[PDB]
């Protein structure tokens, strides 16, 4: 679902970096490794959290029971 | 279709009544020549008019089955074509399966 706030292994806050990672991937032609390095994720424990996130929340939000379809 | 081939190869089942008519009175030859399943629809009570469209989400939420009507026309044949009485008879709601041609998705 939505991006976890903190990295599991150590505790570094990665919940403010998903949108930045997506912007760095989309606007600039940065590889995932370079984008993660620019975001400040040096350890692979922190790197995996943003590199392997799925973001199922966007798929979940398409089913809204309080708005006419 | 397989259903149409099945009813075609079933054949006609024949009965007699005692009304003196060489064997026993007149002859009855009941058969089926067309089986049709329709996509599920909802009567919405008794309003009818244009029938509503049921969906698997509605079936799951209602905790009921997702079935469409089954239609059969009986070839009520008397004395080998002397007098034929066609009549389409519904046979309840046949449970239809999702993403098939008889489903709304």
């Amino acid at each position: 679902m939505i991006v976890p706030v903190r990295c599991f292994s150590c505790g570094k806050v990665v919940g403010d970096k998903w949108e930045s990672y997506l912007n760095l991937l989309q606007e600039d032609e940065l590889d995932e490794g370079t984008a993660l390095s620019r975001l400040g994720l040096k350890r692979y424990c922190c790197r995996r959290m943003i590199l392997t996130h799925v973001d199922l929340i966007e798929k979940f939000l398409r089913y809204n029971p309080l708005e006419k379809r | 279709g397989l259903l149409n081939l099945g009813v075609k190869d079933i054949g006609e089942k024949v009965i007699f009544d005692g009304k003196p008519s060489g064997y026993l009175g007149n002859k009855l030859s009941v058969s089926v020549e067309q089986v049709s399943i329709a996509k599920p629809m909802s009567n919405d009570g008794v309003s009818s008019a244009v029938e509503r469209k049921v969906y698997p989400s509605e079936s799951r939420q209602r905790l009921t089955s997702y079935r469409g009507k089954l239609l059969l026309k009986l070839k009520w044949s008397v004395n080998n074509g002397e007098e034929n009485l066609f009549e389409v008879r519904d046979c309840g709601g046949l449970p239809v399966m999702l993403q098939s041609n008889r489903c709304h998705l």
């Binding site: 809204n64 029971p65 309080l66 | 909802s42 009570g45 309003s47 509503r52 509605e58 939420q61 209602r62």
Partner: protein
């Protein structure tokens, strides 16, 4: 105004001896709406 239709998502309300159906369409499934009520939790 405590119910929401399950197909057109229109808010409505019910009364005694009232049909369980939408007032704008024929759907007979009404999701219960979430109201404002204190629900204490723990951030653990």
């Amino acid at each position: 105004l405590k119910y929401i239709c399950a197909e057109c998502s229109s808010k409505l309300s019910l009364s005694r001896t009232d049909a369980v159906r939408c007032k704008d369409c024929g759907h007979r499934i009404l999701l219960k709406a979430r109201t404002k009520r204190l629900v204490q939790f723990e951030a653990r």
